[PDB]
Design an enzyme around this catalytic site. Sequence first.
Site, mmCIF file in Angstrom:
data_model
loop_
_atom_site.group_PDB
_atom_site.id
_atom_site.type_symbol
_atom_site.label_atom_id
_atom_site.label_comp_id
_atom_site.label_asym_id
_atom_site.label_seq_id
_atom_site.Cartn_x
_atom_site.Cartn_y
_atom_site.Cartn_z
ATOM 1 N N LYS A 73 -23.615 -21.054 16.711
ATOM 2 C CA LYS A 73 -24.364 -20.072 17.413
ATOM 3 C C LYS A 73 -24.392 -19.758 18.818
ATOM 4 O O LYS A 73 -24.062 -20.582 19.749
ATOM 5 C CB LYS A 73 -25.800 -20.939 17.223
ATOM 6 C CG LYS A 73 -26.943 -20.516 18.291
ATOM 7 C CD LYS A 73 -28.401 -20.952 17.704
ATOM 8 C CE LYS A 73 -29.648 -20.568 18.726
ATOM 9 N NZ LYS A 73 -30.698 -21.181 18.135
ATOM 10 N N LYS A 96 -25.955 -17.568 22.085
ATOM 11 C CA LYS A 96 -27.136 -17.099 22.601
ATOM 12 C C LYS A 96 -26.974 -15.971 23.426
ATOM 13 O O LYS A 96 -25.862 -15.944 24.212
ATOM 14 C CB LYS A 96 -27.788 -18.034 23.634
ATOM 15 C CG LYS A 96 -28.522 -19.134 22.673
ATOM 16 C CD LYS A 96 -29.525 -19.706 23.547
ATOM 17 C CE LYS A 96 -30.789 -20.367 22.734
ATOM 18 N NZ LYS A 96 -30.647 -21.784 22.606
ATOM 19 N N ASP A 104 -28.605 -15.805 18.591
ATOM 20 C CA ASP A 104 -30.134 -15.760 18.964
ATOM 21 C C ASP A 104 -30.177 -14.876 20.274
ATOM 22 O O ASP A 104 -29.477 -15.083 21.033
ATOM 23 C CB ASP A 104 -30.235 -17.311 19.143
ATOM 24 C CG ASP A 104 -31.719 -17.461 19.390
ATOM 25 O OD1 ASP A 104 -32.653 -16.755 19.463
ATOM 26 O OD2 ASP A 104 -32.000 -18.839 19.333
ATOM 27 N N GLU A 131 -31.057 -14.126 15.148
ATOM 28 C CA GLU A 131 -32.174 -14.867 15.506
ATOM 29 C C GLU A 131 -32.939 -14.088 16.411
ATOM 30 O O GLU A 131 -32.623 -13.898 17.433
ATOM 31 C CB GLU A 131 -32.131 -16.170 15.675
ATOM 32 C CG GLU A 131 -33.457 -16.898 15.933
ATOM 33 C CD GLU A 131 -33.204 -18.318 16.405
ATOM 34 O OE1 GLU A 131 -31.894 -18.755 16.239
ATOM 35 O OE2 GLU A 131 -34.109 -19.204 16.636
ATOM 36 N N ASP A 171 -38.442 -16.575 15.011
ATOM 37 C CA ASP A 171 -38.380 -17.830 15.911
ATOM 38 C C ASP A 171 -39.753 -17.814 16.700
ATOM 39 O O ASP A 171 -40.831 -18.291 16.368
ATOM 40 C CB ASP A 171 -37.219 -18.216 16.773
ATOM 41 C CG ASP A 171 -37.317 -19.295 17.424
ATOM 42 O OD1 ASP A 171 -38.321 -20.257 17.186
ATOM 43 O OD2 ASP A 171 -36.242 -19.668 18.035
ATOM 44 N N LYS A 224 -40.071 -25.214 13.715
ATOM 45 C CA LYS A 224 -40.039 -26.061 14.863
ATOM 46 C C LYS A 224 -41.429 -26.703 15.036
ATOM 47 O O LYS A 224 -42.475 -26.088 15.248
ATOM 48 C CB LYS A 224 -39.728 -25.148 16.054
ATOM 49 C CG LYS A 224 -38.433 -24.528 16.207
ATOM 50 C CD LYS A 224 -38.357 -23.844 17.715
ATOM 51 C CE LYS A 224 -36.919 -23.104 17.820
ATOM 52 N NZ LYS A 224 -36.655 -22.351 19.215
ATOM 53 N N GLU A 235 -30.509 -26.898 13.420
ATOM 54 C CA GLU A 235 -29.823 -26.905 14.761
ATOM 55 C C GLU A 235 -30.149 -28.202 15.607
ATOM 56 O O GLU A 235 -30.345 -27.949 16.836
ATOM 57 C CB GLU A 235 -30.196 -25.539 15.590
ATOM 58 C CG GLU A 235 -31.510 -25.286 15.388
ATOM 59 C CD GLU A 235 -31.843 -24.240 16.287
ATOM 60 O OE1 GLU A 235 -31.101 -23.314 16.557
ATOM 61 O OE2 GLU A 235 -33.183 -24.028 16.932
#
Lengths: 359, 359, 358, 358
Positions: free
Chosen positions: A154, A156, A185, A211, A236, A260, A314
């Site tokens: 992933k 960012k 993300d 994401e 998210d 989460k 993750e």
Amino acid sequence: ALIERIDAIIVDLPTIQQQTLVVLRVRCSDGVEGIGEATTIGGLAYGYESPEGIKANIDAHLAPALIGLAADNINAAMLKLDKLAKGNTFAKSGIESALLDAQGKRLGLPVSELLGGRVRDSLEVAWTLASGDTARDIAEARHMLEIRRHRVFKLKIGANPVEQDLKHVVTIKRELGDSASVRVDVNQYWDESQAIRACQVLGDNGIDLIEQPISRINRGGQVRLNQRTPAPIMADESIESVEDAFSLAADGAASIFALKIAKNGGPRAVLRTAQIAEAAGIGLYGGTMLEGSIGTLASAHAFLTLRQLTWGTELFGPLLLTEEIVNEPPQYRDFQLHIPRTPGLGLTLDEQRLARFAR
Amino acid sequence: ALIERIDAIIVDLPTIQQQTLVVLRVRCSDGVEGIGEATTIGGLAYGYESPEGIKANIDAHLAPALIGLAADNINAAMLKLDKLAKGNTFAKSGIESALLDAQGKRLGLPVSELLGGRVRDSLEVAWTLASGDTARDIAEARHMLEIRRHRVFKLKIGANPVEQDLKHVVTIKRELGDSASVRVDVNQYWDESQAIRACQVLGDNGIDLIEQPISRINRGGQVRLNQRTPAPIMADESIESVEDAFSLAADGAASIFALKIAKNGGPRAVLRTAQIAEAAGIGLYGGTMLEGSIGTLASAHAFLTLRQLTWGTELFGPLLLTEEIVNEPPQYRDFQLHIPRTPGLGLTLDEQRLARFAR
Amino acid sequence: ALIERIDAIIVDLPTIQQTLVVLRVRCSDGVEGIGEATTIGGLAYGYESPEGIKANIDAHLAPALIGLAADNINAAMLKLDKLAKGNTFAKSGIESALLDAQGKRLGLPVSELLGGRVRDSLEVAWTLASGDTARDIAEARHMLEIRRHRVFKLKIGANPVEQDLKHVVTIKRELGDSASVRVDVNQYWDESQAIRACQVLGDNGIDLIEQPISRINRGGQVRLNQRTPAPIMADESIESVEDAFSLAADGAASIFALKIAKNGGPRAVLRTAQIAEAAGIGLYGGTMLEGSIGTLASAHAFLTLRQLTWGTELFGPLLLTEEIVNEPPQYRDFQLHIPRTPGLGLTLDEQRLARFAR
Amino acid sequence: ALIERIDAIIVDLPTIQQTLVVLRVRCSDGVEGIGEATTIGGLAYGYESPEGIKANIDAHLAPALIGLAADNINAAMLKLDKLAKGNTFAKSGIESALLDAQGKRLGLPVSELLGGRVRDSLEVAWTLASGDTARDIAEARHMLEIRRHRVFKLKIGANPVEQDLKHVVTIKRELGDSASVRVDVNQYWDESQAIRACQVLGDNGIDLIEQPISRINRGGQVRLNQRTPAPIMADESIESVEDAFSLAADGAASIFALKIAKNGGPRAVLRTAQIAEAAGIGLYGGTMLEGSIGTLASAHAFLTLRQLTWGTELFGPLLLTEEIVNEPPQYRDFQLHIPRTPGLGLTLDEQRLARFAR
């Protein structure tokens, strides 16, 4: 068994510069103590809750309300906190985690068992390529694949010019090819005008999912991107509560939900979000706020009860820590995180390291 | 301080054939005078307000209503004009600009300061390639890039056969490549049946955004194009008021809004549109009606208070003028317009040139 | 003028106690700005508690502003937005203090800094809180008698529906045309309960129904906004300026309650107010029960609004027995009167501040 | 503890007959769990009949669970979902039995296994079934007299509209405030009939209207939910947890009736209940007229719910003259009282089981 005491300790741990965690210790009248974790990323940048505010609120409002209540009635304790406190999901997550840990130890069962029962014993774990240097990232990805630690990566993005971030990601994907899954993300950094072409490029160049490309404030744009992006969109930050998840599913705002415990209110609360998702046909992903083993394992016991997690998890928080305040190192082997069937969270506090890193 | 006098002077200025401006002068009881500008493009073709009608309305209705009111209560003065007059945004823009100029001088602060405070001191400025000759346009773009004056170019299209306009634009983009951003402005010239394929070609050939492809009368087509065009759609003419902007954001009619003080009612009114846009996650662009330094600077002081302007601005009006009725030439250097922190708009009238060009 | 120091002080005041968080922003030019971040009863009415507000201002918010220009408030506030998400009460207290210091600096009232006022006083409602019907009617009659209030609010939802309904209707029945009666459900009922409740209320002359159901039921608010015979007001559904946009775009309420604490300050509340104006939504000046400082910061912003169809509920200071401010609020003839003095026109009562500080 | 054997027994009990399907799950550790899969009158109220339920448990469902871990209920239930679609009544009976065995094993009541209770008793409604207006009013007055029920339900829709309406209104007219009157149409009317019926009902103090039209008319339920003066409750529209999500997303009802049999068990019903909570929907504990076992499994789940705005209708055992259970349900003071004993706190009356088994 009654809840006798609740401590909230802020700990600063060194990373591969430091991760701050709020460690919770709940002592029950029968000698059993449960542990939990309320962790966030960089103070207030990734939520309204900071370690200081979390400790302030647990000490001043949340804990006083539970002292003297039955330890084994988790439903009553959490419902009570909801009545007394709006939001504060991170704080509630740590408390629930500690209460579930304590109950598991008390009955000799693992937390996943209290949550219904596991359907697997291990979970796929993605890995964030964080150097910012394209070449290094490619090198790192190949290394992790070679030692069989990760095969899902992933990136960012969102903080640099769109073309720069795009070039970076597409290059890593071309180089790795079909040997690894590459996801991005954006953490709400782009506005819809930017995301339009960006999602198109990413989707067209082999990126598996995108994401949170845009801000949670643009609900309409999330619906449109969910319909037009070549790669599926994962929510998210749009999820800050179980009700948000229901709202997002009814609107068709995303085809995947990141799960989460910190943004939902604990292990049990994340199962509600997952269930809302399951009922609507939305895909699941096991998310993290980079917590250590306690919060990672609390998250893990919940995810083990889920039918499918199309996109894996993750849960790599512990791998970023050089030191931990727990005695049992987590099991990462063959692309996954392996979870024991031991009592509670199956963790024991390293009292020496806790005293050393507490602030 | 009371508003003592308001003059509306129509001026015809020579261009690189001529631009007509309405210069406003508001004299307050404390000796301070503020200046403003109400400008439009070609009489009535780009709005219901012409320089003649603007002067007629300021003299006959708008000014009489303000004489004797407090100069420093800008909110009360503008709210009063709204009550007395429907629309007339260009006229109201000049008056607000003059009132803000006067208040800034009076308190020793720049207009951006009165508007909250700047977060930057300069703004990116696009440039319209206007020769109509493809080769000349390419030559011009390269020149502007070489002297570091512009790196973002805009082509005005819609008046020729679709294929002809398309060929023109795509050729300029292929030639310039990734050295410059190329955008198009159709000014409502196409109907949706034409825009369908046109937006597709443009989007597929590197054009960054498409400004107002179809008429403001087709709200549904703007919503559809906002969902299907490969390049993001910017609203310009669809916005003739702050309420129009709210309406467009609620409908998901565009992902970018052009910000023009003249179409909103002044510097303060454009901040309302911007704020509605910000609240919905819509991208911003600093627009112009080709005003001289007064109106360009009035626009600029407002844009400096904005968090992000994803697409820059097109404040190049002064560069088209051979003569100006202001003494301070604007600062264009390194792709941007630089704004002083001097009192008010930081401008002084060239009385000699004003008398000469007034009509 | 740069920001030199920011003090956040928790103070407990006795009521006719209420905990306030007082902010003191000292600037390099000697000018001090004061502000207030207040909520009702711990975490029951928001995500922020006095203890968390202080913890966050001290550890995160304040450190980011030390050294910045005190006179560029937009720049300072945009900085906090970037470093911290949410935290509207803290952000509100800070902005209020900055605007206060800036008003003092320029010798202008906060309302002028925000554009200029269109009125000098605001209509103020009163919450009948004895819980006893005869007692409430007696209290309302008295306020009407001394010309202090003519608009009364009743907090309901915590008792069996029929009881609460019987209560409110009787009060309106007894007062009749002499007063405007309204209710606040604070998200207590579910849609299935509000259906009949709203109908009964409206049929009996109640002017408005504030937040009948939970912000989590968006579809219900949209439905209630279309069916309730009395207009529906959004309060808890508003937790940021964007929420206001969202509710407006959905047609979820015909009136928005405006609270600086829930939006992030007198400027953030104006953004919410303007989105509402652009959509045709009615406005109402709300409160989180703050003392004079918070009440005045709210007021100075509400004075710039073209129209506040349903008035305000800025009676906060009236509930307090002692204040840490030197200038008592001017409540007269159904309204709160706001001077044109610099800043918020208030000064700290050092003696009393030290006495009630904790 | 592994699942060793699963017995599904059809039993016909006399009423004041009702056919039940009793499940006996024996585990390797000697612990036996008991459950119940019951429907009303053959196939008229669901897709499952006692005979089909047994046929399917014996031939498909049970074989898949023999040998599995008895203590991992989620794993066992997810297995049935994969091998068989629908079949909620059978799945419900099986889950109830597993939770019972697990409660006994751990010495904890089912409500604790599901998270922990927030109450010890549930409000119970009563269906006035004589079909005679004077007789119904006399029956209701009596229940009110002995303090057994204060909430009455009337099953209508099988007679000319005006007749049914006249019936219900008279009953409410006579009882007035002493009781809560509700109706259940069980999908009998079409939208064109419900338009006026709902209006009349609501105007006459009926608290809620359960399933006025058919689940096949989604648009009508959405319309009735917006126009009916009395809240609309979904019952037959719910045939799975996903249906609950769908109805919630559409705004088709303001109240959801909760029935373990229609969702698939005490856990599946909690999933439905939570989706409803997340959307602001009112809850109602429903029944398929089961005896104590089914009624208790339902109850233990309903005890964990934060709120049941409209109470329950768990009067099932009361309709029976004899039970195959040793512990009679505790009905007192308008409620059903649930102990904290292990599992469902019930044991099989072997003698009576053999007598009524078929």
